[PDB]
Each structure stands twice: as C-alpha cells, then as structure tokens.
Curated annotation (Swiss-Prot):
Record gene name: Lgals3
Shown residues in whole-protein numbering: 128 to 264 of 264
Keywords: Acetylation, Cytoplasm, Differentiation, Disulfide bond, IgE-binding protein, Immunity, Innate immunity, Lectin, mRNA processing, mRNA splicing, Nucleus, Phosphoprotein, Repeat, Secreted, Spliceosome
Assembly behavior: Probably forms homo- or heterodimers. Interacts with DMBT1. Interacts with CD6 and ALCAM. Forms a complex with the ITGA3, ITGB1 and CSPG4. Interacts with LGALS3BP, LYPD3, ZFTRAF1 and UACA. Interacts with TRIM16; this interaction mediates autophagy of damage endomembranes. Interacts with and inhibits by binding NCR3/NKp30.
Tissues where the protein occurs: The highest levels are found in activated macrophages.
Protein's name according to its UniProt entry: Galectin-3
C-alpha cells in the first residue's frame, strides 16, 4: 500500500471496532504516525519516534483547530528498524486500546468523544504497509 495511506472510515468508529495495521518498519526509521482524523482535527495521533534526543518514545495527542494538546508519552517501545509490526487499535467507549505484536501497549482516553465523525485513518512515516483492516469484535 502506498504510504502515506488514508484508510476510509465512512461509518466512523465505535466501541468494539478493532483496527489492524500490518507492515515492516524501514531501515534507519525516524518516525511512524497513525492519525484518526475528524475533518481537519486529529482525534488520536499515535506517533512512535525512533530518535528524539537519542531516545525512543511513543507520543500520543489530539489536534483541535490546528493546535496540539498535551502529549501523552510512553517509553515502552516495541518497534525496531527493518522489522515487521502489527499495530492493533481497539475502540472502547472511554478510550482507544493499542497493542503491538500481540502485546497491549497503551490506552488513550478519548478527548474528542463524537466517534461517528472520525472519518479516516492516516498511516504515515517510515514503513512498508501491507494491510489496514477493521472488524467488530
Ligand atoms: O504533539 C504531537 C505533535 O508533535 C509535533 S513535534 C512537538 O513540537 C512542539 C513544539 O513546541 C514541542 O517541542 C513538542 N514537545 C516535545 C517534548 C518533549 C518532552 C519530553 C522529552 C522530549 F525529548 C521532548 N515536549 N513537547 C514536540 O513533540 C509534531 O510535529 C506533530 N506531527 C508529527 C507528524 C508526522 C507526519 C508524518 C509522519 C509522521 F510520523 C509524523 N505530523 N505532525 C505531532 O507529532
């Protein structure tokens, strides 16, 4: 799949929706991002960074009217340059759950609670993308 990729979500999202994203991180990667978009806003941005001041970190945030909010940062970092990944995002009523490679990673509480208007999932950064699917579980 061509990166950056925009997965259409015309139905929006809703509790019990699982999004499964598979691919391989490129060699010498710098960044990856998932953007759950609502028009011009980003309800949930999930952004692994491989070298921010010589640290690996996951940054999560929301963008409202061109302004980013308070970042939620994780040092737990399951990605490796050149290696395959499987990111899974489970939508729940109060939060997104994120798992990587079949291990729960983090939760992000909803900040923008109108899940029906999250209309696209952007998938960007330093990856080869195999697949991006959703299902109700
Ligand atoms: O919030 C999420 C956003 O972050 C800014 S960078 C942001 O800039 C701010 C400027 O004042 C602060 O410096 C902020 N910051 C750092 C720290 C800190 C705290 C502790 C340690 C430590 F070192 C550092 N605290 N605050 C930075 O994260 C990115 O551009 C943005 N973005 C990314 C992408 C993007 C596009 C395509 C692909 C891709 F992967 C990403 N498209 N938009 C998005 O990811």
């Amino acid at each position: 799949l061509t990166v950056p990729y925009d997965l259409p979500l015309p139905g929006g999202v809703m509790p019990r929706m699982l999004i499964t994203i598979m691919g391989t991180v490129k060699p010498n990667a710098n960044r990856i991002a998932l953007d759950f978009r609502r028009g011009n806003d980003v309800a949930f941005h999930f952004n692994p960074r491989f070298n921010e001041n010589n640290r690996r970190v996951i940054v999560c945030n929301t963008k409202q009217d061109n302004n980013w909010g308070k970042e939620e940062r994780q040092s737990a970092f399951p990605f490796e340059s050149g290696k395959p990944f499987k990111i899974q995002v489970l939508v729940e009523a109060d939060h997104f759950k994120v798992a990587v490679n079949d291990a729960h990673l983090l939760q992000y509480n909803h900040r923008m609670k109108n899940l029906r208007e999250i209309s696209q999932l952007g998938i960007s950064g330093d990856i080869t993308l195999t697949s991006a699917n959703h299902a109700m579980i």
